[PDB]
Ligand binder design. Sequence first.
Ligand code: GTP
Ligand code: SAM
Ligand code: ADN
Ligand code: ZN
Length: 361
Amino acid sequence: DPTEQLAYFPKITFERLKNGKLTRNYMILLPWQHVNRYNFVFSSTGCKVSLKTCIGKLMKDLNPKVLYFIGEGAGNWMARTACEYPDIKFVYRSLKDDLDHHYPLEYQRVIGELSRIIDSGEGLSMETTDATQKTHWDLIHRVSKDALLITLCDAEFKDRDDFFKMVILWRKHVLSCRICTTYGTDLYLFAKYHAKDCNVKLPFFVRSVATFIMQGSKLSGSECYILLTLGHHNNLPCHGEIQNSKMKIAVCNDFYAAKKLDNKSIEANCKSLLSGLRIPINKKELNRQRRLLTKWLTNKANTIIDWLEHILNSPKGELNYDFFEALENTYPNMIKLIDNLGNAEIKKLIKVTGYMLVSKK
Ligand SMILES: Nc1nc2c(ncn2[C@@H]2O[C@H](COP(=O)(O)OP(=O)(O)OP(=O)(O)O)[C@@H](O)[C@H]2O)c(=O)[nH]1
Ligand SMILES: C[S@@+](CC[C@H](N)C(=O)[O-])C[C@H]1O[C@@H](n2cnc3c(N)ncnc32)[C@H](O)[C@@H]1O
Ligand SMILES: Nc1ncnc2c1ncn2[C@@H]1O[C@H](CO)[C@@H](O)[C@H]1O
Ligand SMILES: [Zn+2]
């Protein structure tokens, strides 16, 4: 039942900016945005962004039967959407390159099966899975004959110019396509954007309706989600506007823990971080992991156990950046930890840390 899987997803905090300076330098080196993402394995974007939370009214008003997810990788965002809207069908696209997922592995794990994905991009070439290519847009209706009422794009492009290439092709499709033109101009593209320079105009006849600043976005970044439509063009958000909104959330809000614990998922993340790690993670479990060690792999294992021991011995606090800064700055081996563990391992470490923090008291 998709509605029961929704309790594994944490509540989202965000700010909507419809179309003084606040600063706080958090002395953090870890990707703490994954703190409440312990229930998800291959991807976890759904813990950060949600269609019901951000564009609930638009979802209700347009009432799409089919949603188009492009640059959707393992499909966790699509999976949360499938839990929020149990009757909606999906068209999935993601760049086929073998660097990331081009099959919705996380959607499959969360939902159980792919019956609601009517088009998963089976038999498509690298070119026809690429959102910056015209052929990708020309083949978007090979299964679904429903107009692109709402298109979702979470693609992380190799170059900044690729975002514009994608937006131009979305506009060229919705203004040419027999299916989409028949529906009209009330069509939307909800896309991930990294805010940089100001006075950067959107392509001709592409208009931003709102800018969404998510609590779950990387603190050092400038990521945001823009709701785009057809109409007289305006400017993209710049780094400055996004910083104030993002700093307020970081300073004032706590991360919500998921209502329910997904034990199979938590165990899958624990074993992925340290092979053989069991739940509950206590003094007994960490001493057992230490005893198994008695090399490069043992050095990495010791670094992990030392951090989990520090979390175990740490006092309980609220899930916020002030507490995260305290956790890092009370740990004497911080620089050795970031030096020893890679980006993927550190991300797994934060999910497991988050599970431990939520489990306290
Ligand atoms: N490798 C990996 N990436 C994930 C996983 N779950 C989510 N992500 C990524 O994490 C992102 C969360 O947004 P951010 O905080 O903006 O990004 P980031 O580039 O992942 O972050 P940092 O780890 O802080 O460098 C998602 O959009 C995904 O790209 C996961 O299990 N593994
Ligand atoms: C942030 S991940 C998407 C995560 C997804 N929302 C989830 O919940 O699993 C970004 C994805 O964009 C893909 N991508 C990168 N460039 C792309 C392009 N040109 N066209 C389509 N997808 C692209 C990457 O392969 C990657 O899977
Ligand atoms: N969705 C996007 N919106 C804006 N810029 C992007 C996007 N994806 C990647 N980039 C930019 O591409 C650059 C090179 O990978 C990065 O510095 C990043 O800012
Ligand atoms: Zn169309």
